[PDB]
Amino acid sequence: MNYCFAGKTSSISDLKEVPRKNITLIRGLGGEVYEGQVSPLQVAVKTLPEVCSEQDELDFLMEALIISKFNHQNIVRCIGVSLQSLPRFILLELMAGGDLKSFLRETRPRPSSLAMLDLLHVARDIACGCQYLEENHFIHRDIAARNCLLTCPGPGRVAKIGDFGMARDIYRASRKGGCAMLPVKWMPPEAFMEGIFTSKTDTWSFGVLLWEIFSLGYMPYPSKSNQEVLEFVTSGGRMDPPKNCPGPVYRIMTQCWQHQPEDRPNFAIILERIEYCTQDPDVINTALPIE
Ligand SMILES: O=S(=O)(O)CCS
Numbered sequence: 574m575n576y577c578f579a580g581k582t583s584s585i586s587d588l589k590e591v592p593r594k595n596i597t598l599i600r601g602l603g604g605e606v607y608e609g610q611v612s613p614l615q616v617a618v619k620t621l622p623e624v625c626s627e628q629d630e631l632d633f634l635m636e637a638l639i640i641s642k643f644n645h646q647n648i649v650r651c652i653g654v655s656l657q658s659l660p661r662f663i664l665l666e667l668m669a670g671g672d673l674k675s676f677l678r679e680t681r682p683r684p685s686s687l688a689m690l691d692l693l694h695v696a697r698d699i700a701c702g703c704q705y706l707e708e709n710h711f712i713h714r715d716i717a718a719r720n721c722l723l724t725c726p727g728p729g730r731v732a733k734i735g736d737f738g739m740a741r742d743i744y745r746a747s748r749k750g751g752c753a754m755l756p757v758k759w760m761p762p763e764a765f766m767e768g769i770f771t772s773k774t775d776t777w778s779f780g781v782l783l784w785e786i787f788s789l790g791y792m793p794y795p796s797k798s799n800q801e802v803l804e805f806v807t808s809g810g811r812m813d814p815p816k817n818c819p820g821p822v823y824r825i826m827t828q829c830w831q832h833q834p835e836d837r838p839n840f841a842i843i844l845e846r847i848e849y850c851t852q853d854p855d856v857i858n859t860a861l862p863i864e
């Protein structure tokens with residue numbers, strides 16, 4: 574089983590095998606993910622339940638190959654693997670801030686020290702990750718708050734793309750899925766109607782991620798079902814600004830949601846616009862709404 578990224582092919586053997594005796598599990602984090610320890614390296618441990626098929630297993634191995642090939646500060650690092658023992662482990666950078674959706678929901682003023690500039694820095698981090706993917710011709714297909722993770726909860730947090738399950742499914746023709754499992758609320762019309770995916774479909778998903786960030790972890794199209802969203806969006810319908818969202822930030826969203834992919838910005842342009850936003854005192858002095 575082979576995988577190519579950045580003009581270089583790899584196989585299972587290129588993965589760094591960490592001896593099982595070197596690995597200790599410390600707690601469940603919510604297959605399963607554990608906080609673990611290599612010795613001392615603090616790690617996250619993703620496990621493959623032994624009750625899965627040989628196909629699920631190859632899926633798991635492809636996921637490991639994909640993540641190990643990236644080299645970017647805004648994509649979660651793969652520390653190595655433990656594949657010569659059952660259950661199989663993948664070892665990842667421990668992300669102590671947990672997922673972005675949970676973080677937003679948990680740290681929203683109800684008062685807190687989270688501010689507009691902090692949200693924009695998270696958006697910038699993920700857009701930087703996305704630009705690296707785009708430049709390297711990799712289509713994520715599943716950009717969303719639940720798939721982003723934070724290094725820590727506090728002021729110096731860095732956000733990173735931390736799940737590549739959907740991209741992996743395509744490299745393995747995974748079928749094993751179905752309609753009810755497709756992240757419909759994050760997908761542009763050409764993706765959900767035609768099964769067409771490009772870097773401009775990640776641009777669309779990024780705009781919905783922005784809405785997630787600035788609404789502080791609300792579900793997109795909060796009062797609509799998947800099918801209602803499909804009908805809404807195909808008819809030109811777009812989400813309203815999140816509560817208190819500055820106009821320059823909402824404008825990035827609406828640009829990401831242009832009906833034709835060719836009219837949507839690439840990630841370099843998205844990054845320029847996020848930066849403009851962090852430079853505007855009227856943007857970053859805006860207060861977050863209280864729960
Ligand atoms: O779909 S999964 O590989 O995560 C579970 C199979 S046991």
Ligand SMILES: O=S(=O)(O)CCS
Pocket residue numbers: 697700701702704844
């Ligand atoms: O300009 S930044 O260093 O903040 C992001 C590079 S993608």
